[PDB]
Scaffold this active site. Structure first.
Site, PDB file in Angstrom:
ATOM      1  N   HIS B 464       0.845  -1.178   0.000  1.00  0.00           N
ATOM      2  CA  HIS B 464       0.000   0.000   0.000  1.00  0.00           C
ATOM      3  C   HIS B 464       0.896   1.249   0.000  1.00  0.00           C
ATOM      4  O   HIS B 464       1.894   1.311   0.738  1.00  0.00           O
ATOM      5  CB  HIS B 464      -0.851  -0.016   1.249  1.00  0.00           C
TER       6      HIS B 464
HETATM    7  C1  LIG Z   1       4.738   9.240   7.240  1.00  0.00           C
HETATM    8  C2  LIG Z   1       4.241   7.785   7.274  1.00  0.00           C
HETATM    9  C3  LIG Z   1       4.160   7.074   6.057  1.00  0.00           C
HETATM   10  C4  LIG Z   1       3.646   5.747   6.019  1.00  0.00           C
HETATM   11  N1  LIG Z   1       3.570   5.060   4.821  1.00  0.00           N
HETATM   12  C5  LIG Z   1       3.147   3.771   4.720  1.00  0.00           C
HETATM   13  C6  LIG Z   1       3.072   3.157   3.460  1.00  0.00           C
HETATM   14  O1  LIG Z   1       3.397   3.734   2.350  1.00  0.00           O
HETATM   15  N2  LIG Z   1       2.603   1.852   3.474  1.00  0.00           N
HETATM   16  C7  LIG Z   1       2.189   1.176   4.614  1.00  0.00           C
HETATM   17  O2  LIG Z   1       1.774   0.016   4.542  1.00  0.00           O
HETATM   18  N3  LIG Z   1       2.282   1.799   5.827  1.00  0.00           N
HETATM   19  C8  LIG Z   1       2.749   3.105   5.896  1.00  0.00           C
HETATM   20  N4  LIG Z   1       2.825   3.761   7.139  1.00  0.00           N
HETATM   21  C9  LIG Z   1       2.409   3.034   8.379  1.00  0.00           C
HETATM   22  C10 LIG Z   1       0.905   3.050   8.478  1.00  0.00           C
HETATM   23  O3  LIG Z   1       0.404   4.380   8.534  1.00  0.00           O
HETATM   24  C11 LIG Z   1       0.581   2.413   9.808  1.00  0.00           C
HETATM   25  O4  LIG Z   1       1.245   1.207   9.807  1.00  0.00           O
HETATM   26  C12 LIG Z   1      -0.900   2.137  10.029  1.00  0.00           C
HETATM   27  O5  LIG Z   1      -1.673   3.319   9.977  1.00  0.00           O
HETATM   28  C13 LIG Z   1      -1.110   1.441  11.368  1.00  0.00           C
HETATM   29  O6  LIG Z   1      -2.512   1.359  11.560  1.00  0.00           O
HETATM   30  P1  LIG Z   1      -3.148   1.130  12.997  1.00  0.00           P
HETATM   31  O7  LIG Z   1      -4.572   0.542  12.779  1.00  0.00           O
HETATM   32  O8  LIG Z   1      -2.219   0.294  13.815  1.00  0.00           O
HETATM   33  O9  LIG Z   1      -3.237   2.623  13.528  1.00  0.00           O
HETATM   34  P2  LIG Z   1      -3.604   4.001  12.824  1.00  0.00           P
HETATM   35  O10 LIG Z   1      -3.987   3.852  11.337  1.00  0.00           O
HETATM   36  O11 LIG Z   1      -2.382   4.804  13.156  1.00  0.00           O
HETATM   37  O12 LIG Z   1      -4.885   4.468  13.693  1.00  0.00           O
HETATM   38  C14 LIG Z   1      -4.730   4.762  15.097  1.00  0.00           C
HETATM   39  C15 LIG Z   1      -5.799   5.766  15.474  1.00  0.00           C
HETATM   40  O13 LIG Z   1      -6.020   5.827  16.897  1.00  0.00           O
HETATM   41  C16 LIG Z   1      -6.289   7.194  17.184  1.00  0.00           C
HETATM   42  N5  LIG Z   1      -6.051   7.298  18.624  1.00  0.00           N
HETATM   43  C17 LIG Z   1      -4.841   7.280  19.273  1.00  0.00           C
HETATM   44  N6  LIG Z   1      -5.114   7.273  20.603  1.00  0.00           N
HETATM   45  C18 LIG Z   1      -6.430   7.241  20.828  1.00  0.00           C
HETATM   46  C19 LIG Z   1      -7.176   7.249  22.004  1.00  0.00           C
HETATM   47  N7  LIG Z   1      -6.556   7.181  23.188  1.00  0.00           N
HETATM   48  N8  LIG Z   1      -8.546   7.200  21.911  1.00  0.00           N
HETATM   49  C20 LIG Z   1      -9.180   7.178  20.669  1.00  0.00           C
HETATM   50  N9  LIG Z   1      -8.428   7.199  19.501  1.00  0.00           N
HETATM   51  C21 LIG Z   1      -7.056   7.239  19.585  1.00  0.00           C
HETATM   52  C22 LIG Z   1      -5.459   8.051  16.240  1.00  0.00           C
HETATM   53  O14 LIG Z   1      -6.133   9.284  16.070  1.00  0.00           O
HETATM   54  C23 LIG Z   1      -5.429   7.181  14.989  1.00  0.00           C
HETATM   55  O15 LIG Z   1      -6.433   7.590  14.086  1.00  0.00           O
HETATM   56  C24 LIG Z   1       3.268   5.100   7.201  1.00  0.00           C
HETATM   57  C25 LIG Z   1       3.353   5.804   8.403  1.00  0.00           C
HETATM   58  C26 LIG Z   1       3.800   7.139   8.431  1.00  0.00           C
HETATM   59  C27 LIG Z   1       3.838   7.797   9.795  1.00  0.00           C
END
Ligand SMILES: Cc1cc2nc3c(=O)[nH]c(=O)nc-3n(C[C@H](O)[C@H](O)[C@H](O)COP(=O)(O)OP(=O)(O)OC[C@H]3O[C@@H](n4cnc5c(N)ncnc54)[C@H](O)[C@@H]3O)c2cc1C
Ligand SMILES: Cc1cc2nc3c(=O)[nH]c(=O)nc-3n(C[C@H](O)[C@H](O)[C@H](O)COP(=O)(O)OP(=O)(O)OC[C@H]3O[C@@H](n4cnc5c(N)ncnc54)[C@H](O)[C@@H]3O)c2cc1C
Ligand SMILES: CC1=Nc2ccc(Cl)cc2[C@H](c2ccccc2)N1CCNC(=O)c1ccco1
Ligand SMILES: CC1=Nc2ccc(Cl)cc2[C@H](c2ccccc2)N1CCNC(=O)c1ccco1
Ligand SMILES: [Cl-]
Ligand SMILES: [Cl-]
Ligand SMILES: [Cl-]
Ligand SMILES: [Cl-]
Ligand SMILES: [Cl-]
Ligand SMILES: [Cl-]
Ligand SMILES: [Cl-]
Ligand SMILES: [Cl-]
Ligand SMILES: [Cl-]
Ligand code: NA
Ligand code: NA
Lengths: 484, 489
Positions: B464
């Site tokens: 992705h």
């Molecule tokens: C600059 C950058 C580029 C990236 N590029 C890629 C890429 O090209 N390809 C790829 O596969 N991955 C990429 N990643 C990694 C990818 O974004 C993450 O791996 C992914 O979003 C992880 O998803 P998650 O469900 O673990 O959390 P997230 O998608 O991070 O969702 C976590 C959510 O919890 C919320 N939150 C936090 N604390 C609380 C709370 N206490 N109460 C309620 N809500 C809360 C936040 O607002 C956030 O929306 C990138 C990351 C960054 C930082």
């Protein structure tokens, strides 16, 4: 109310888990996030990190950055225009990107409003008790309650957060979160880190910098992109250098001072110093466990700070799970989506299912980009007696004409030479992230080097290189690299 | 007195994709003495193909350079949405610089291949026209005229026919005022108005090329004698490419076929179609097909049989009816693709001179169309699968990707289709339309050779954000075929 599932964080893992639960199993679902659309103050929001301040916006911004090369390369193919009239308008890019991301935010809010049994709640989620999830006004635990939600099962999916080393002056530095909202492109920037975010941003700042600008990336060790193929780490270093980015290896900031003019005076451990307009810290990301009050129910964390989970995403507390970057395994959007889908299968489905963390294909959107799946040769050489490495490395013809002679395409296949099984594939060059996708499918079917070599090429492509190699360039025997 | 002819294990007539792979392999892997004959040592008129073959000289290689050049029309426009600013009224497409650049690039490959002949022991080149004098005699003459002087008479244990194909030019009044792809590569100026005749990859590709370089006020028109361009390709794709060509300003005339061409008094061409319609253009490029190039080989001297269509008939191992005479590549009229001719040449030399008899697999071969945006495809289209499999599943994904909302090119819908044997999940075909499709499809070709199922695709974790990840995110069919019939079960 009460609910089958309460999800903390509307992110990649969370939105996936909370949609399967409501649409595949008619369950009652609550999903908490801190913001409904992208940007300051909290950056991530409904959609998660990837959508608001990660993969999605960064890809549009690297796509914008690639026009710097396109405009120049066009001349080679007989395109003529006034070069002196060219400007990179950063404010237009960020406004365009903002509208795109906002459209996804609104559209994810659409889907909440139109799905029954899937409710979104605004605020900060924490563990009150074994089956009660509090939502407060702010990240402060002392703050006002907006809701207490009862839940059979609780999903922890709050993602990660930039790691900011505690050096003096750290507070004069930004992270990638702020990078997405700079109102001006920086003329001088230092990106601190040898990993994908640092590299990708260096390429973005490099294309949008004002006249006389300079991007410097620094890294505390010898060679950037630790964890990637070594030929590719060296070659991306040369190609970033050829496009004007300065790479400072073996250097690490020890102090940042704020100048009166708003610029930053960086002092390194070596005592070297550099002045820049912006210091972007991209040395890592850490699991976002702090505001969850995991003490209130004794959910354990690893030495590294991530929620500890077994292969099925279960924490030590019954009915409480964790997926995604909070668990600190593979910090990728589609890994989190897979984990969340599998969790819901293993809890309100009949078949238990676990995420396989091996052979996951991934990409660096550097300029030029990287596409990889599987083991690098030095990891393979430690787990396998005989390893062969097939390498091809040619500046493609389009790039002789374009003038970008430094753009070598690199294709490597790593095998267990004893039975010919493909252990890893590693690519550098335009199209590499697209080429590697179905390579990941091959590695699932235990592809051998002869399965590659016997497939007929599509010509002319960079990809066909992967179906043209039948002789090893070299081998590791008992960990020792060698010619024959 | 008399003296000895130069003698070879293998004489290859045609130094192109197939002939060169065969010749190289026989000489360097199996120690054979090999003669390779071609009519020119470098690209261009009078004979267009040369050392390197059609692909190097007047096919895949220069055409991809020209398509890459044509893509800058789109990039320069698209960049505005990502904030690039420049003086748009200064922009011009300099065709002459393109053609000069591509000629240089092709000439360096010609020079490189000649250096390889010179450096490689047991591998010899002959300039001239090859023909079969008898079962073990190849003669090389001054011209294609069988009465021109003999330059060399070669003794040959084995003979490989690898002379390729040639543009098919319909016998209509004024055909002589038309060109083919051959001459398109050497136009001194880009045509202001051009008609490309034909609905296959060559017409379509060249239509996009001429579209990008045409001068102010120009127009490109493509006609096709049938209803829908690109027969053989997935049907959703055929219709989308048609729409995407239209959106970029190309005029597609379907159900039209030229019946005659006259020269106007200004030197432009007046085309009359079967239907009675007419069209004036500067250039008429006939791209209605390519026919096996069998006419100069004097095959009757030895009785090599042709197929009803005119290819040299061969069995699965590339053998003709005449022992020690073989035929690979476009002259056999199977699949006209460079890497198939290459695969045939390797397999044939392995069989004849090696110890590994092998036949080329012509099923599940990946190929591409360098339309803008391009097609990548491998395996069966659904209407062919539906005829051979009782239950067929079709997984379809389609949408304007997000960069193209921002770029402004909203007509640019990406299409990804996976066609399955639904009784066991086996992937029969994968069909892609959009940026990077030819690059995405290559490893798909490997998947199909491993008999991948849909469940292997779906189970693989996405990269992705890519277009390619659409292939790994599809679990539920869009529709089915149940004994020939379309529905959702
Ligand atoms: C600059 C950058 C580029 C990236 N590029 C890629 C890429 O090209 N390809 C790829 O596969 N991955 C990429 N990643 C990694 C990818 O974004 C993450 O791996 C992914 O979003 C992880 O998803 P998650 O469900 O673990 O959390 P997230 O998608 O991070 O969702 C976590 C959510 O919890 C919320 N939150 C936090 N604390 C609380 C709370 N206490 N109460 C309620 N809500 C809360 C936040 O607002 C956030 O929306 C990138 C990351 C960054 C930082
Ligand atoms: C415009 C165009 C675009 C194409 N694009 C692609 C593409 O993107 N991808 C792809 O895979 N395929 C493409 N092809 C097809 C590809 O070029 C052919 O399939 C391939 O070259 C066939 O290989 P071959 O070995 O049969 O013959 P060729 O490569 O055609 O070689 C035959 C050679 O024989 C020589 N010759 C003919 N007669 C004699 C004689 N009597 N004596 C001595 N020499 C003789 C000719 O000079 C020629 O050099 C394209 C073709 C064209 C015309
Ligand atoms: C399946 C799914 N997975 C996600 C994974 C990660 C993220 Cl960040 C977003 C989604 C997305 C989604 C969007 C809003 C709520 C829940 C899920 N989403 C919904 C996509 N499908 C549809 O909206 C739909 C409409 C009609 C039928 O399916
Ligand atoms: C293997 C091979 N296959 C071809 C298939 C199609 C074409 Cl059009 C060209 C070749 C090319 C070749 C080039 C000159 C004579 C014979 C073969 N060729 C040889 C490429 N060169 C080498 O492998 C090489 C040169 C020097 C060291 O290795
Ligand atoms: Cl700006
Ligand atoms: Cl560092
Ligand atoms: Cl290192
Ligand atoms: Cl990081
Ligand atoms: Cl890419
Ligand atoms: Cl011109
Ligand atoms: Cl036609
Ligand atoms: Cl039709
Ligand atoms: Cl044709
Ligand atoms: Na191959
Ligand atoms: Na998948």
């Amino acid at each position: 109310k009460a609910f089958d599932l309460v999800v903390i964080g509307a992110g990649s893992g969370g939105l996936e888990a909370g949609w399967n639960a409501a649409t595949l199993y008619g369950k009652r679902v609550a999903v908490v996030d801190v913001q409904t659309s992208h940007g300051p103050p909290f950056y991530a929001a409904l959609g998660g990190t990837c959508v608001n301040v990660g993969c999605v916006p960064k890809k549009l911004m690297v796509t914008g950055a690639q026009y710097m090369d396109h405009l120049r390369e066009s001349a080679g193919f007989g395109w003529e225009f006034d070069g002196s009239s060219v400007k990179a308008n950063w404010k237009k890019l960020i406004a365009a990107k903002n509208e795109a991301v906002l459209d996804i935010n609104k559209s994810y809010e659409g889907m909440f409003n139109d799905t029954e049994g899937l409710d979104f709640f605004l605020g900060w989620g924490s563990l009150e008790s074994k089956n009660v999830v509090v939502v407060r006004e702010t990240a402060d635990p002392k703050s006002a309650v907006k809701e207490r939600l009862q839940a059979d099962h609780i999903l922890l999916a709050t993602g990660s957060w930039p790691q900011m080393p505690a050096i003096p002056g750290i507070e004069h530095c930004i992270s990638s979160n702020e990078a997405f909202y700079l109102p001006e492109p920086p003329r001088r920037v230092l990106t601190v880190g040898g990993g994908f975010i640092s590299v990708e941003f260096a390429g973005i700042f490099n294309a949008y910098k004002p006249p006389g600008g300079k991007v410097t990336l620094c890294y505390r060790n010898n060679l950037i992109l630790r964890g990637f193929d070594e030929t590719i780490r060296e070659e991306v270093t040369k190609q970033l250098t050829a496009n004007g980015i300065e790479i400072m290896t073996n250097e690490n900031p020890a102090k940042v001072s704020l100048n009166t003019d708003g610029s930053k005076h960086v002092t390194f451990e070596s005592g070297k110093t550099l002045d820049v307009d912006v210091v972007m810290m991209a040395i890592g990301r850490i699991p976002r466990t702090n505001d969850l009050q995991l003490g209130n129910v004794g959910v354990k964390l690893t030495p590294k700070g991530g929620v500890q989970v077994d292969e099925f995403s279960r924490t030590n507390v019954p009915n409480i799970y964790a997926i995604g970057d909070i668990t600190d395994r593979l910090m990728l959007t589609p890994v989190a989506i897979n984990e969340g889908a599998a969790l819901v299968d293993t809890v309100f489905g009949n078949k238990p299912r676990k995420t396989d963390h091996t052979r996951v294909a991934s990409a660096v959107f550097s300029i030029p980009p990287i596409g990889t799946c599987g083991l690098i040769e030095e990891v393979a050489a430690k787990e396998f007696e005989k390893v062969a490495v097939y390498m091809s490395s040619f500046t493609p013809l389009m790039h002789n004409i374009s003038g970008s002679k430094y753009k070598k395409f690199v294709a490597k296949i790593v095998t267990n030479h004893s039975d010919g099984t493909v252990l890893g594939v590693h690519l550098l060059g335009d199209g590499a992230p697209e080429i590697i996708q179905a390579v990941g499918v091959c590695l699932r079917l235990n592809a051998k080097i002869s399965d590659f070599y016997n497939t007929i090429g599509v010509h002319p492509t960079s990809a066909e290189e992967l179906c043209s190699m039948r002789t090893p360039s070299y081998y590791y025997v008992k960990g020792e690299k060698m010619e024959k």
